[PDB]
From a paper:
In this paper, we present a strategy to fuse specific, high-affinity protein binders to obtain multivalent or multispecific scaffolds of predetermined geometry. DARPins are used as building blocks to confer the desired specificity to the construct. A series of rigid connector modules replacing the DARPin capping repeats allow to combine the individual DARPin domains in such a way that their distance and angle can be altered to test different geometries, bringing the binding partners of the DARPins into a defined spatial arrangement. The two helices are not just joined end-to-end, but instead the two domains are made to overlap in such a way that the joining helix is stabilized by contacts with the domain cores along its entire length.
Constructs off7_H09_3G124 (crystallized at pH 4.6) and off7_H12_3G124 (crystallized at pH 5.0) diffracted to 1.9 Å and 2.4 Å resolution, respectively. In these structures the ligands were lost from the complex at acidic crystallization conditions. In the off7_H09_3G124 structure, residues 141–156 are clearly visible in the electron density map, but the angle between the last helix of the N-terminal DARPin domain and the H09 connector substantially differs from the design. However, this construct crystallized at pH 4.6. DARPin repeats carry a conserved TPLH motif in the first helix of the N-cap5, 23, and protonation of the histidine residues in this motif reduces stability and weakens the binding affinity of the DARPin moiety, leading to the loss of MBP and GFP from the ternary complex. Nonetheless, independent binding data at neutral pH strongly indicate that the conformation in solution must be closely similar to the design.
Author numbering: 8 to 322
């Protein structure tokens, strides 16, 4: 006998034709929701492609395999993303779909959403852990596919938004957001119009945890803003000694000059952070450095009455 096979075929065709009620009557009368045609296409594939959200939901509640792949390796999530069905994308992810499934060519759902500039879908995929730098067997990334189809400006908008959010998270000290943004593709070395990078902000506002994360992820420890200030300049001014150390342990230049000629020692002796001076001195800070006014860090320590600092600098 072959009643089960007969029901499966009728279900596939009812789904292929967008006959929601016919699909659900067949299901109610025993049709196998995990049936598949010659190409491995299942009913869930067809509902995800056609955008029939109600059918996607009931199929999943009836045990449809959310990650079923056809002969080319497409899952329902691949189709939902390629054909621009945001709600279905969200439902499949809620039901355990592999966000980073690969087809035979190695393309992920994020590849396909990026290709058409479906920004809302791109962002949900990244929120669920989509591999932002994934490459297919030919080395093409989601950004590459967007550019090839004239949608690069939409990917640049994504990156601009991630850049804004990373700077905000680094300035406000939100460790968890920083990590999730970096993993979603945020450029750790992005800078605003005045050359301030996330590391500048974290070091200035005293967010040690984020300084370590940014450096581990490749932030330039000696990046200079518009005024020539490195993160060590700002940390020395604000008085964050643990950050001063970390920056030095990661290769910060102790004698970096801003535009006025100030080294971190100029700024620390001025600010009155004695131990910072001692750490800088221990790390080879040049006590003889003169700024644009010909003044040394010793000259600045006097002008602030930090005789303890002006005494150790003498030694």
């Amino acid at each position: 006998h072959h009643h089960g096979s007969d029901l499966g075929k009728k279900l596939l065709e009812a789904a292929r034709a967008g006959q929601d009620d016919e699909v659900r009557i067949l299901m109610a009368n025993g049709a196998d929701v995990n049936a598949a045609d010659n190409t491995g296409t299942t009913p869930l594939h067809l509902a995800a492609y056609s955008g029939h959200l109600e059918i996607v939901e009931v199929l999943l509640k009836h045990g449809a395999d959310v990650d079923a792949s056809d002969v080319f390796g497409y899952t329902p999530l691949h189709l939902a993303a390629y054909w621009g069905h945001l709600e279905i994308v969200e439902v499949l992810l809620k039901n355990g779909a592999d966000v980073n499934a690969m087809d035979s060519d190695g393309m992920t759902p994020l590849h396909l959403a990026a290709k058409w500039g479906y920004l809302e879908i791109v962002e949900v995929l990244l929120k669920h852990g989509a591999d932002v730098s994934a490459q297919d067997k030919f080395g093409k990334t989601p950004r590459d596919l967007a550019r090839d189809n004239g949608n690069e400006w939409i990917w640049k908008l994504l990156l601009d938004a991630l850049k804004y959010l990373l700077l905000e998270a680094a300035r406000e000290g939100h460790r968890d957001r920083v990590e999730k943004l970096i993993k979603a593709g945020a450029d750790v070395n992005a800078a605003d119009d005045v050359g301030v990078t996330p590391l500048h902000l974290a070091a200035q506002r005293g967010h040690l945890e984020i300084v370590e994360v940014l450096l581990k992820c490749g932030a330039d420890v000696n990046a200079a803003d518009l005024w020539g200030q490195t993160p060590l300049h700002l940390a020395a001014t604000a008085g964050h000694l643990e950050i001063v150390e970390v920056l030095l342990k990661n290769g910060a230049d102790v004698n970096a000059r801003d535009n006025i000629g100030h080294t971190p020692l100029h700024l620390a002796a001025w600010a009155g952070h004695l131990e910072i001076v001692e750490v800088l001195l221990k790390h080879g800070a040049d006590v003889n450095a003169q700024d644009k006014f010909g003044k040394t860090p010793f000259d600045l320590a006097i002008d602030n009455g930090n005789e303890d600092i002006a005494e150790v600098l003498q030694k």
